[model samples]
Target: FTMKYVGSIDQGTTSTRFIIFDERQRPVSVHQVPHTQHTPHPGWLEHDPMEIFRSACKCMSVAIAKLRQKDASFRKIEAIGITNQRETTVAWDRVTKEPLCYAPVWNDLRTYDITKKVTAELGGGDSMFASKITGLPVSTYFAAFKMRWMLENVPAVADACRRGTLCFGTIDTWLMYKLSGGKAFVTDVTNASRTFLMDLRTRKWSPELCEKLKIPMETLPEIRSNSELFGYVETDECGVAAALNERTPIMGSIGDQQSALFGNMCFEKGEAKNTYGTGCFLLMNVGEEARFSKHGLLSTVGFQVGRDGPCYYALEGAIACAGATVEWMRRNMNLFSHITECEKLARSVPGTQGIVFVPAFSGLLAPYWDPSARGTIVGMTLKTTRAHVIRAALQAIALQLNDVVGSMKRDAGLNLSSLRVDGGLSKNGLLMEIQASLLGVDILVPSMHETTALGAALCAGLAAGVWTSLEEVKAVSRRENSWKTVSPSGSAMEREAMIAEWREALKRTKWAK
Candidate 1:
């Protein structure tokens, strides 16, 4: 196939998006469909895996139609590449390709008990050994145990998995299966790393891990490098790429964050990037060796190029709430229609005025790692207004990300002078300044944000031979906006004081199931 335009199915926690980009790495047309999020319990989250699959199919079909009507060259779409939210686990019948139930979302915590038991049995509270081997603290946030529980409790899934007739995947694999019309089963390296099922040494799914998780051996996908020709197009029995986009090959996928890392061109060891969405995810490139964190962090695959490790690695810390808190303030509380009001209103407040919110709506992740922990807002007073609450919200994001940097520095043995940040919150200068002041350094904001989407486009382009080289793709990155650095401004003692307060507040949070 002489690939020209690249199309991407960019799946995330809250939305399914189909975007087509031109040869210059720009979005031509994109359509998004927001899906209903299922919450079975206080901290449990899920999505109808089939609903997502169908949604993608319909949107891709429609988007392609719209593209064809707008541009006569729509048939030139060469290959499909995907970048999706990591951790959300989907299990389906291998033979039928029917989902057993809704996908256990990345935010789901129903499997926490399973995680605790797995940790105790696997390492017996030997945190050092746990961190060293798994490259992450055992938690339901990673897929292994949740997947195991789903298999054990769901009889249909268990039967299918044991029969070697079940397929389990993170979002990418699920999307891959659906895109290939149920013929392909594959997951990218970054998505695989989040499962806690892959061996840290081999960076491959381990038989020992499957045995520990009690998940059936045949249910998983073949893990591939971040950039590679994943599989061929498996159209209908009649066979077509949704209409002569050619039954082309799909290539170069990764979990959304790793894709962000690659798209941001955080190519070298020691480089890092943070993406803020419903949550804030900070990943610092740590090179080939898995540098397990002793102080609270996760070690995961950064990007793998081909068969083995190009081996770029990352240490990560995730925050459960970042933009969601701001959205909460906007939608639930009715403080503002535009979330930017958070920055505008908080700018004058100077500080949160002793009011602090833990914003652990789900629970803390990464450096905190307390899925059992709950949310709280401390120091409320009659004088507290929307400004104070909003300030606390923005500050909460900064505080969490600051904790991430603290963890990254400890794990990597180097300090980052500035952070390359993007996401809704990254658009707020006051929030960026708050992030900078808290950390006492500059926060670098990139001009182009579709970094996640652009990543998929770039991957598709590279694979389809539309854009040529990594060097070519990187040269196009241009900064559109920035934040002038702010500081705690000699309030180093006060900054430490505030951090201590956060630690104490976190301690008071009840980590009960």
Candidate 2:
């Protein structure tokens, strides 16, 4: 096929989106549907895997229709790319093709007990031999912990495993398997890196980690490069055949963070980017070698070009809550109806009136790693108003990101020249200025903010021969390709004082301590 366009299926924790890109790899149209999140327990987050699949199909169909409305040759879309929420584990029966249980979301902490037990059994904590194998700690955030929890707790999953009918995978793997009509059960290197079962050096499933975790090696999917044709879309199915032709080869597949990293064009060592979505994900490219973090960051695959190319590594410091805090203020506090009001309301207030918000709703990730830590608000009095609270939320977002970047700089032993940023919250002018002040570096934003989707499209386009090389991939851009740089203006002394004060308030949030 003379590939003239590429499609990206961007599946995230909050929504499923389908976007079509022209030959230039610029988005022409997009269709998205939000998913219902389930919180069955205090710290448990889940999703109906079947609903996710259904939503993807619907979105893809709608987006293609929209694309056709713009250009009659929408059929020129020759390849499909996939980028999704990483580490959200799902299990299903191979024979029935039905979900055995709801997916254990990436942030779910229900497996804390299981993680502790596994760590103890391994004879050491996160620094043990396990981290050396997987570049991850035995934490609830990874697929291995979630899988172990299911084997010990979920009856259907355990039975399926015993019967040798279990098929388990992360979001990307599950979607690819279903999209290919159950013919493919595979994950890309980027997604596989987050499972805690894949070897960082070898880029495959680690037998030692699998045996230690008591997960059957056969249940896992075949790991492949981030950009390659895994299988064709199964046209034999009802809706699958129409949205995209049956022969459209599924090309690129990667984790959302890794996709963002590539989309930002941070392909060289010491290049860094942070995505401010529901959470703040900061990734710094650490070259080819997996530099396991001693300073509390995750070492995982950044992106891979082809099977034979080098697998770039990254050190990630994920803040569990960034935009979610602003969301809480909107839904719970009724501070504002639209997110745009967040900046206006915050700017109206001189400051938070010394108020601070620590959004540890699902516990803190990276550096802190405190699952026991809960959400907290400090320095508020009768003088404070709703605007003050909203302002505090924005400040918290920047502060959290600053902390993550600090950890990254410390681990890498180099200061970042600039930070490339994207996602929903990145559009907030007030927040971006504050982020620049807090980090004391240029905060760079691309004219097109949907870099996550763009990255996946670039990968797929390369595979489909829409583009040839990484240099060409990075050069391909939309007409609106421009840069906005926010530079630091605030005093260093004030920034230090604010950070020190927040750390004190952070100490009070750890109720378990």
* The candidate that achieves the highest TM-score relative to the unseen native structure: 2
Deviation in angstroms for 135 in model 2?
1.4
Candidate 2's residue-wise lDDT over 196-255, tens digit each? 889889998988788878989989999999888888777334365676754788898989
- The runs of at least 3 residues in candidate 2 whose Cα sits more than 4 Å from the true structure, single-residue gaps closed, are 1-3, 34-42, 125-129, 236-238, 334-337, 349-357, 360-363, 369-389, 478-480, 503-513
- The residue-level lDDT of candidate 1 at 130 comes to 49
Could you tell me how far off, in angstroms, the CA of residue 467 lies in candidate 2 after the best superposition? 1.6
Candidate 1 per-residue C-alpha lDDT over 1-513 given as tens digits, one digit per residue, 9 for 90 to 100: 433787788888888887887776666777788788998779878899877876666656667777888887666567777998789998888667689888888868888788778767776865344466568777778888778878778888777766777788999898788777787788887888888778777877788767766776677898887767887666442222555356767786888888888777777776778888878888888887788786677888888765664778888877878888888889898988886567788887867778788888887776666767777888888989889888888877888888888888877887765566777677888777767778876666666577787777777677667767767666655422233434445377767767877777787777667
Residue 213 lDDT (model 2):
80
lDDT of 1 at 477: 53
Clashes of 2: 0
Per-model TM-score, in order, reads: 0.87, 0.90
> Listing every candidate in turn, what is its Cα RMSD in Å to the true structure after a full C-alpha superposition?
3.6, 2.9
